[PDB]
Design a protein around this ligand. Structure first.
Ligand SMILES: NC(=O)c1ccc[n+]([C@@H]2O[C@H](COP(=O)([O-])OP(=O)(O)OC[C@H]3O[C@@H](n4cnc5c(N)ncnc54)[C@H](OP(=O)(O)O)[C@@H]3O)[C@@H](O)[C@H]2O)c1
Ligand SMILES: NC(=O)c1ccc[n+]([C@@H]2O[C@H](COP(=O)([O-])OP(=O)(O)OC[C@H]3O[C@@H](n4cnc5c(N)ncnc54)[C@H](OP(=O)(O)O)[C@@H]3O)[C@@H](O)[C@H]2O)c1
Ligand SMILES: NC(=O)c1ccc[n+]([C@@H]2O[C@H](COP(=O)([O-])OP(=O)(O)OC[C@H]3O[C@@H](n4cnc5c(N)ncnc54)[C@H](OP(=O)(O)O)[C@@H]3O)[C@@H](O)[C@H]2O)c1
Ligand SMILES: NC(=O)c1ccc[n+]([C@@H]2O[C@H](COP(=O)([O-])OP(=O)(O)OC[C@H]3O[C@@H](n4cnc5c(N)ncnc54)[C@H](OP(=O)(O)O)[C@@H]3O)[C@@H](O)[C@H]2O)c1
Ligand SMILES: [Mg+2]
Ligand SMILES: [Mg+2]
Lengths: 261, 261, 261, 261, 5
């Protein structure tokens, strides 16, 4: 009567080879979920898949979430091996900070398509299987930029806010279908993406990278960056049957930077 | 005429031939703004322009806000008579309620492009003129669907929430440039769009249109639909110089259906 | 706003001899409301009443909002001269920042009583008259501390958040009774009290007052303090009949410091 | 969750003999925490203590959270057996719904004192011990009434919103002290008390209890009541070291009734 | 069943 885990559940995690996505995949692997991991670069993805095979059955699929044809094929292949996806984690993102007048059509569309469009399409592909099983979890990794504004991140904020809107509406539409839909909203988290953003902001503001890293930690009242495992801890909590009442929520993992209500 | 608050200010209102947009245009005309009214159909637009010439200088421009080429030409033509736009009201919207699995790519894109992409593009075209003048107002007409979820309106909620994100981020980026950026979030409002939505929902749920109308009014704690002039009243208030401290806000006009904080 | 809009409406403003309350009283006076002003010190109250008689009929009553017996007598006297109160502005507040462990019972209770308990009692006294007239406006001056946390202001944040709770619940309870209940949430505002505090810190730290003012304004994205007239402008807007659809709202007047939703 | 996670942590839960508090105590007992349970009636408290001794060391203390002298003595006795309190759960509350004009001083004060004043006092008593240990968890059980309004629950909403304000401000004040402060906001929960109310209304309206339950659950998009164990699951998740980044948050456990941001 | 959870 003691084993209450995710054994026998197929989870698909996008952007799963490094950072937050990798920590989410590790937590789901330790919980017993069968995993389909998606990322564009083979090298990091293969290492992640091999590492997590110590805890569960894992398969990796090279793919860009913004490519609909590649994603349909990827999802079809993944479900042939591990069956319908019960848990979907939309984690792959895109951010390029710049003054609003420097955001041309291409850059606006890339923010919308990677952060929001991709989640819409993947949910549409995997929702029939969840409805058939009578159980599911859809977890969207948004950001504190989905809950409040940030200057120089207008398309990122627009797309991440749109992801919260998708989350809330779908949570209500699926409320009596056995599926919950929630968003996890990290603040600045210690990842390779954040280190790339540190150098971009330093170059754009004529500041030393170390000084801008200290500014990033100062947005968090706790005076430190969020760890990827703390974001993953929120994700695995939502997958339990005792989190069924958590639906349509945005969980901020930012030390108090944004206090939801 | 005694009301001279916005005298001389060039205001451009999208979707201004009928409904909320026409009421916004009327309130701005009574306050003394010079108006550029945009809509797709010339017939209703020309009649609206002629009506509002009783209070101020008005011109109409035919265009679809989702057509980038037509909007760039439209903006060049509009600035010939009244100069750079000081007040921009992004009001044109799009909604088609349906179950999430019935939202194909084209329908998803129409919700994103009309409600969000169009506002991004028009702000990008008109922001340089506002920055040159050192003063401006950007007002985005979102919805209570930009603040909470509604079942069967997943793309509408995603786009309207994305519009709130654009509003918040741009309010911070422009905070010290003499421009405020805010969103007005109406609940169900008595317009041709709502009447068309009532008939569509009634046909799709096998209910009498009158019963669906009463259900829509029941969401408003006040027991009635919002009037277009009530949404317009919030818009004109934001254009005052005394509303400079109102920035990055979402003003719900829904009788208490959504209570912002 | 027209100088005849609120003619024939008796408005009562608490804490109205100085600061935000004085600015609220002035804006209501310019809109044509008959005013009852309440404050504890006679001299400042008499001067404010005399100043506002340039625009409308004004009367003053000396009183402490935390004294129930004094407030009942005061309210009875005010209504004998100007009739039932149609508009109530709960503006008198209390703040004393300190580390949480230094908040003794009595200091905790003073924050709750002045900012929240007093508003409950005064609304209870004046609500019957509003229900009899079939129209009313209850406007609670909360703070950005009613919408987010601040360190060393735990009782102030608790009381100001409590005032939002009272606002929201009462807005729903009175939604179909012709009365709206709303809250205005200022950020740091430029008053004589704040200027005295700026000068004291400048004198104690050997800094120019302008350097200390920059610290105080740092949370405002607009780089300046909120002006009392900007808070007052939001109050008068809510009193119009065209703001009937604005109910249960918290309007942040803080330049973008808090972005409500 | 592992049955050894919180071993060696002294947790104190107020209002722990029945309902949500009893479920919170049970989940903490299964996680290995040493428990101090507080409630006014001895019989129900003794039964709960005896039941939970199957999983961990438990002690009961008879007391009313609104009695400062009894609570100080209680806390001294409790810390003599299990040492300083590391985890505090403020769960004891009070609600008596009524039309606003029928709320006298005593009824208003009982809502403020039991739901908010008592949490302030108990946190003030136990915070020194948490600061000395360098680790702590303060979890306040608020309600969806802390995040939105409900008609006829004005004092309850005011007090529960005040508890969110206390949570937010204290989370910022203690951010760098090793202590997190969060609030859990349940919607209507299936307790024996609620089932007795369902049966009373069914008996008074000649309806099957299942028909009356549907009215109570109507606000929950999931079409059911929240289970006490779902509220408890959120509490134990917050106590983990991996939830250190969760600070100043309000976690709604209401099926999507309130969607936080 | 082989891997502990
Ligand atoms: N780090 C922060 O401070 C922060 C703050 C707020 C929110 N977030 C959100 O957290 C999520 C993950 O961010 P992160 O910081 O972990 O980023 P990261 O360290 O750069 O990792 C991103 C992962 O996603 C993959 N990826 C990137 N673009 C992809 C695409 N188009 N298709 C498929 N996979 C893709 C990357 O692998 P390949 O490059 O090989 O494809 C990698 O495995 C994002 O949604 C982000 O917006 C992060
Ligand atoms: N219940 C409600 O009515 C409600 C609730 C919440 C939010 N809103 C929002 O309020 C705004 C206005 O809605 P409404 O109810 O007033 O609509 P409406 O009665 O249908 O009027 C819409 C107006 O915009 C024009 N328009 C529509 N699509 C356009 C496009 N692509 N380009 C340019 N003009 C366009 C229409 O004229 P043409 O057809 O000639 O172009 C018309 O002048 C929208 O953003 C909507 O989402 C409405
Ligand atoms: N100033 C800010 O930056 C700021 C920011 C956020 C919110 N607020 C809120 O705005 C409101 C007004 O504050 P303020 O800054 O304008 O204050 P202020 O400059 O100190 O003025 C307070 C006014 O209220 C009166 N007053 C004070 N305590 C009173 C009491 N117990 N009973 C009756 N009258 C009383 C004062 O006159 P007497 O002393 O003669 O009684 C004076 O007329 C408060 O609710 C406050 O919490 C202010
Ligand atoms: N319409 C109504 O009249 C109505 C409806 C609902 C609730 N209520 C009131 O609201 C109160 C709280 O309701 P509830 O939903 O929390 O249910 P409850 O079962 O009364 O209380 C929950 C738990 O907290 C304990 N408790 C209650 N008040 C306490 C206090 N002041 N100090 C310490 N422990 C306390 C209870 O045990 P003990 O009772 O043994 O202390 C129980 O273990 C009720 O006690 C009742 O007075 C009234
Ligand atoms: Mg907020
Ligand atoms: Mg809300």
């Amino acid at each position: 009567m003691d084993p209450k885990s995710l054994v026998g559940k197929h989870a698909l995690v996008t952007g799963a080879s490094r950072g937050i996505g990798a920590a989410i995949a590790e937590a789901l692997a330790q919980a017993g979920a069968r995993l389909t991991l998606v990322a564009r670069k083979l090298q990091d993805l293969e290492e992640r898949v091999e590492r997590l095979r110590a805890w569960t059955e894992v398969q990796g699929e090279v793919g860009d979430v913004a490519d609909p044809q590649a994603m349909e094929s990827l999802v079809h292949r993944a479900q042939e091996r591990f069956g319908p996806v019960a848990i979907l984690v939309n984690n792959a993102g895109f951010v390029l900070t710049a003054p609003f007048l420097e955001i041309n059509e291409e850059l606006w569309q890339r923010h919308i398509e990677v952060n929001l469009g991709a989640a819409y399409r993947l949910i549409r592909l995997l929702l029939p299987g969840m409805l058939e099983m009578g159980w599911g979890r859809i977890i969207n990794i948004s950001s504190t930029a989905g809950l409040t504004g940030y200057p120089y991140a207008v398309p990122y904020c627009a797309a991440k806010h749109g992801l919260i809107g998708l989350t809330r509406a779908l949570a209500l539409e699926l409320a009596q279908r056995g599926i919950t839909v929630n968003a996890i909203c990290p603040g600045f988290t210690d990842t390779d993406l954040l280190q790339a953003s540190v150098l971009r902001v330093a170059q754009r503001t004529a500041r030393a990278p170390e000084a801008v890293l200290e500014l990033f930690a100062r947005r968090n009242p706790q005076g430190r960056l969020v760890r990827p495992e703390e974001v993953a801890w929120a994700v695995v909590w939502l997958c339990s049957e005792k989190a069924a009442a958590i639906n349509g929520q945005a969980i901020a993992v930012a030390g108090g930077e944004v206090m939801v209500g």
